[PDB]
Amino acid sequence: GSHMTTQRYLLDELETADMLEIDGLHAWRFELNENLLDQADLAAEADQPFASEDWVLAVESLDGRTRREWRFSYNAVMEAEPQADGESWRLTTGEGAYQLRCLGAVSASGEDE
């Protein structure tokens, strides 16, 4: 159900988060691959490290009225480094580095897919 409690990855944080910032730019929307997060926690409950290069997080902010969407793999979210801010994570991708800072506690997980 919730194995990552003592293992606090970016995965642990986006489950409970309401707001999500990227490099200081706050996103109004983000969606999660909950189907893959069932399998992620299923592996974690068996004490097995889960790693998949499928998407896990689509981060959408609107600047003006344009949709700006950053998609991160589950692999990138596992390789995301905990920064000294305590909420910020260093997403070092082949496109660039993106600071994902999960804010709030309303739990955005529980949508559909």
User: Following DSSP, what letter does each residue of 70-99 receive, concatenated?
Assistant: EEEEHHHHHSPEEPTTSSEEEEE-SS-EEE
| Discontinuities after residues in the chain (C–N over 2.5 A) | none
Residues of the domain holding 7: 1-113
Cite the DSSP H helix spans in 1-113. 10-16, 34-44, 74-78
Task: Return d(Cα 109, Cα 113) in angstroms, integer.
Answer: 10
Burial 73-86 (b: 16+ CB within 10 A, else e): bbbbbbbbeeeeee
CB 21 within 8 A of CB 101: yes
Task: Return d(Cα 6, Cα 97) in angstroms, integer.
Answer: 26
Dihedrals phi, psi of 71, to nearest 5 degrees: -110, 130
Burial 16-53 (b: 16+ CB within 10 A, else e): ebebbbbeeeebeebbbbeebbeebbeebeeeeebebe
Looking at the DSSP assignment, which residues form a beta bridge with residue 112?
none
Dihedrals phi, psi of 36, to nearest 5 degrees: -80, -25
Task: Return d(Cα 48, Cα 27) in angstroms, integer.
Answer: 32
Token pair listed for 38: 């069932």
Dihedrals phi, psi of 12, to nearest 5 degrees: -60, -35
8 burial (CB, 10 Å; 0-12 / 13-18 / 19+) is exposed
Dihedrals phi, psi of 11, to nearest 5 degrees: -60, -45
Count the domains in the chain.
Answer: 1
Give the CATH number for residue 28: 2.30.29.190
CB 105 within 8 A of CB 18: yes
